[PDB]
Amino acid sequence: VSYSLCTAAFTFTKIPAETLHGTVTVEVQYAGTDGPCKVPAQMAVDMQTLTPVGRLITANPVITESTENSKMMLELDPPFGDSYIVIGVGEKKITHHWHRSGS
């Protein structure tokens, strides 16, 4: 039995940060009381087409009923160069530009 997607709004609490593994971490809060629900998170090449690239690493991206105002960290493996972190789906999704150095 799986959970439906989260339908409420996410916000970034701090600026995304690069890790030793070359991945990026993103700390978000969630305004909804529609939990338990599944956190949508992906990397995109551009903001208009939202073509998926890279991969989400966090294995349990789920908001629970007890989550409330606590903060969640998501970890993604972005492509080399420019891409966008996209948290959530639909009208209220949030994006942040990311650049991964190297080749």
Partner: antibody
């Protein structure tokens, strides 16, 4: 142009069942969440149910949980609502509605069907 | 649940008049509020979303404002095509609750 053609008028006795259908054309049906919205004397204009583009997520207003089931067939571009245990207060015009942006959860509706009158009376 | 109300339920106005109608939420929905217009016997049409962004093809006499718990839809100069019922709808989160509607009638 976007077209949402819903099934014909339905009359049900209390406790009965009914399935509504909505045939879509004029847009990429498999990329949009789809919703059912009803308008009747018992509840006014009221959202009923939403199903994501890939049928992975389904949502229901509390008064229909356990009685109504939403589904879709993307190979025929068709949306379904399976209504069971219908009560008199469910009497309404039922609308097919398309999400404005693709890959969403039914937040906003930019195209609607013509509507299906559903009367529930003994 | 968040309760959506609207005021007034009905008002009469004349062509050229400035018309404002109100939508309220029992608790804050931030900016995620949309407006629809509906004629008798037809389905609603999306007018406006994110409080103040006009849907494509909607004439510029429509405008919205407000934040949190109080929202308004304004028609700067009413035209005959604008006599209809108007609904607000929240989308901070599901359920996607519509307001009860405001009917704009002709004044004489």
């Amino acid at each position: 142009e976007v077209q949402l053609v819903q099934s014909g008028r339905g009359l049900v006795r209390p406790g009965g069942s009914l399935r509504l259908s909505c045939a879509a054309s004029g847009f990429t049906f498999s990329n949009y969440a789809m919703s059912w919205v009803r308008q009747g004397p018992g509840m006014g204009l009221e959202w009923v149910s939403t199903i994501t583009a890939d049928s992975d997520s389904k949502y229901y207003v509390d008064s229909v949980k356990g009685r109504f089931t939403i589904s879709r067939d993307n190979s025929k571009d068709t949306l379904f609502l399976h209504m069971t245990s219908l009560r008199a207060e469910d009497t309404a015009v039922y609308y097919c509605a398309k999400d404005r942006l693709s890959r969403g959860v039914g937040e906003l509706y930019d195209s609607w069907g013509q509507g299906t009158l559903v009367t529930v009376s003994s | 649940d968040i309760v959506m109300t609207q005021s007034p339920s009905t008002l009469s106005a004349s062509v050229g008049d400035r018309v404002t109608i109100t939508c309220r939420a029992s608790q804050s929905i931030d900016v995620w509020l949309a407006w629809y217009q509906q004629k008798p016997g037809k389905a609603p049409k999306l007018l406006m979303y994110k409080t103040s962004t006009l849907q494509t093809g909607v004439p510029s006499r429509f405008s919205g404002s407000g934040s949190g718990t109080e929202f308004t839809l304004t028609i700067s100069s009413l035209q005959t095509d604008d006599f209809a019922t108007y609904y607000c709808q929240k989308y901070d989160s599901y359920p996607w609750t519509f307001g009860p509607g405001t009917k704009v009638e002709i004044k004489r």
